[PDB]
Design a protein around this ligand. Structure first.
Ligand SMILES: CC(=O)Nc1nc2ccc([N+](=O)[O-])cc2s1
Length: 342
């Protein structure tokens, strides 16, 4: 009939009410986000005299233990920042309130998926995409810090918010799915579109999987559409094969889940499995990006920054970001050296 003295609901979520005041400090405005973890709300802090975003975690050990891992990581990252010149969202403070662990974050603006939606999925300019791509490469450079060595493990356009709606400065949010580089515990990781080949193949993974995710995201910010929109793991892998060809033999000879998508003929070479799809590596990125045809669907014809020479620099970086082999996939540091950022 009632859960937690009438504060909680069926699904262990605090019933957020408008105009409620918590701890004589936070004035609740309205619900803004939702997910597995629980809820997210817009709140005004009377002390610091500023808007904040409070992540109200579900009243259940499982979710509370996950949140406590996130806090550990956010405080670990925020300890190595202070200046906030590395594009990780700032965990201000946390506390328990009516049996919910709350995480007070700075109030960020709408996310990149919201930005995509506002273009009717026609995408944004290369000049703005560069800016995002530069900040993210720096963000990943930060996470690659030896003492951190953090894998976000769930990069997508919804986990990339703007600081201000009239600026291009961004922040990465949601480190609930993240864990520091460790021995392989979990295998079904990342959102499907942005899921690396090594994960799909069930091989050892590291911080490179975040790079793959960025590659996929950056193309999508410009074209306006997901690069690899798989309806399931098999489809997802086949959309990748369309663009980049068949993964190298030496990868697939190691892959535990190789046979889920491919088949090893008597010669010792791999081909697809018939279930549809263009042949291996014939839906070229050059053509998707529209290097020599005025960009995605010709919509960027004769705009500054969108020349053949610009697009070619963009294309090259992305191909290095989408390198099948994670040992060779471009590292954050050298991505920033790339001529796309001159
Ligand atoms: C949705 C909106 O208008 N503003 C939001 N800002 C932030 C900032 C941080 C987090 N977070 O969970 O780390 C979520 C949100 S939602």
């Amino acid at each position: 009939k009632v859960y937690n003295d009438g504060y909680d609901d069926d699904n262990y979520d605090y019933i957020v009410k408008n105009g409620e005041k918590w701890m004589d400090r936070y004035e609740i405005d309205s619900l803004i986000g939702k997910g597995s973890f629980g809820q997210v709300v817009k709140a005004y802090d009377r002390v610091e005299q500023e808007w904040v975003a409070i992540k109200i975690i579900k009243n259940k050990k499982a979710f509370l233990n996950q949140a406590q891992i996130e806090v550990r990581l956010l405080e670990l990252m925020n300890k190595h920042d202070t200046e906030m010149k590395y594009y990780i969202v700032h965990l201000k403070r946390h506390f328990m309130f009516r049996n919910h662990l709350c995480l007070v974050f700075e109030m960020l603006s709408y996310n990149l998926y919201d930005l995509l939606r506002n273009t009717n999925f026609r995408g944004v300019s290369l000049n703005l995409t560069r800016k995002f791509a530069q900040q993210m490469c720096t963000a990943l450079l930060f996470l690659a810090t030896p003492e951190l060595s953090i894998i976000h493990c769930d990069l997508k356009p919804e986990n990339i918010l703007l600081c201000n709606p009239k600026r291009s400065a961004i922040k990465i949010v949601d480190f609930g799915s993240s864990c520091q580089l460790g021995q392989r515990i979990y295998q079904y990781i990342q959102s499907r579109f942005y899921r690396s080949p090594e994960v799909l193949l069930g091989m050892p993974y590291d911080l490179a999987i975040d790079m793959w995710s960025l590659g996929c995201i950056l193309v999508e910010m410009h074209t306006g559409e997901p690069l690899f929109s798989g309806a399931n793991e098999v489809d997802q892998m086949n959309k990748i094969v369309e663009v980049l060809g068949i993964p190298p033999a030496h990868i697939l000879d190691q892959a535990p889940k190789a046979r889920k998508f491919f088949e090893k003929l008597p010669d010792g070479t791999w081909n697809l499995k018939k279930t549809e799809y263009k042949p291996p590596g014939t839906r070229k990125l050059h053509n998707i990006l529209g290097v020599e045809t005025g960009g995605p669907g010709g919509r960027r014809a004769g705009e500054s920054g969108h020349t053949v020479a610009d697009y070619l620099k963009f294309k090259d970086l992305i191909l290095r970001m989408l390198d099948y082999d994670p040992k060779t996939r471009i590292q954050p540091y050298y991505a920033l050296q790339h001529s796309f950022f001159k």
